[PDB]
Write a protein that binds this ligand. Structure first.
Ligand SMILES: [Ca+2]
Ligand SMILES: [Ca+2]
Lengths: 243, 243
């Protein structure tokens, strides 16, 4: 079928070669209420990632009674916990900002939230994790039906005109843009949306809604520690939180 | 605030205590084109899960030229590969079935597909992984924008009236319903949908579409092998596919 010459299109995004593995660990020894999303080019840093999530579990706090009976990541408490973490590390940035909108599509809200998180991460880091970051924020406001009973989402007060819920997600990043450190970015969402739960469960990005959202997050940089030498038992203990 | 007596509602689904961890492994030594979704109560069986996915990567085959340039899991080749896997194991079930619909919502198609996969797994196994199974099938037909460039989804022929694409997902199951074995269920989707790619990218469960879908899958039961004793280096090699 005669070999044609190369028509090199320089804007054609190539298919990813990244391997994605999702772990659902039933009945963990200790409960973890953070959705853990880990970016890693060297799997020897996975344990470190899981241990950072174990640490920031202690930074979750109850919401006010008016909101409901829910847990959310606290930036203030996050700072406290950061100091106690070993090996020692630094809080590069932190945010506690409200985001609102009126009668806009859910896609707009996802963007507004993305803007805040992209500010936290920075251009370089943002770009290296844009796919999972976009997906993670998307899954905060949509695809909630399948998530409704998960350990990282908490349903608060539910009126006829409003639904309150929290959503806890953590990003661990180790790649070319990080170098000799692994970044950790826990995010605690406190969301008020102008719809009944039943509608919220099946909200899409096309749907329109008014939002009042509080975003609490920080970026924690911890020097890399390989775990190749250690047995898998330690990783198992890390996942269970018994390490 | 006076302690009221217990109003025990026996149909109130409790919140999950399950810990969910997602691993994105950039630049793996060997490429893996299966979305790996692992259900595990004992993390000592993770390596086994990842090694089963490594094995069934060899069961992916190109689609016909008329469909496009895509890879999909082949049930026939899956059976061949199953025999070569060590430790030895058994193919409990296998399917190669077409599923179609006309002018129905995407939710209906998700159900039709679920029915087939639930048949493969069986009542007990199905129920133990219903959340991730429902989500996985949902993400096959929706939420494709964030997935569009991922390693497990391949875009074929794209006309003005039709989009062709494949979607490769693998479930590893180790829990109370499995006992002393781990089940492995690779699934190769070959999907023709009556819409342009741009529309397909932002398809929701509310959208209506005609579908022609081929589903190829099998259930592989391999006796459990704990990896607690082995170092994490082996797991790292398993993820890279160099083990
Ligand atoms: Ca990346
Ligand atoms: Ca389960």
């Amino acid at each position: 079928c005669p070999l044609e010459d190369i028509k090199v299109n320089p804007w054609k995004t190539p298919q990813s070669t990244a391997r994605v593995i999702t772990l659902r660990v039933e009945d963990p020894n200790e409960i973890n209420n953070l959705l853990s999303i880990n970016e890693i080019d060297n799997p020897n840093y996975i344990l470190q990632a899981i241990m950072l999530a174990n640490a920031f579990q202690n930074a979750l706090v109850p919401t006010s009674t008016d909101f409901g009976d829910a847990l959310r990541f606290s930036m203030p408490k996050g700072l406290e916990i950061a100091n106690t973490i070993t090996p020692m590390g630094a809080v590069v940035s932190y945010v506690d900002q409200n985001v609102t909108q009126t009668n806009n599509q859910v896609s707009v809200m996802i963007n507004k939230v993305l803007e805040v998180l992209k500010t936290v991460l920075g251009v370089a880091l943002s770009g290296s994790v844009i796919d999972q970051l976009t997906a993670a924020v998307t899954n905060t406001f949509t695809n909630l039906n399948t998530q409704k009973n998960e350990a990282w989402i908490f349903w608060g007060k539910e009126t006829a005109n409003q639904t309150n819920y929290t959503y806890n997600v953590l990003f661990a990043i180790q790649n070319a843009q990080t170098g000799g450190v692994m970044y950790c970015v826990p995010v605690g969402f406190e969301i008020k949306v102008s719809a009944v739960k039943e509608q919220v469960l099946f909200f899409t990005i096309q749907d329109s809604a008014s939002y009042n959202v509080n975003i609490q997050s920080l970026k924690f940089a911890q020097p890399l520690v390989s775990s190749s030498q250690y047995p898998i038992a330690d990783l198992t203990s890390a996942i269970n939180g018994t390490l």
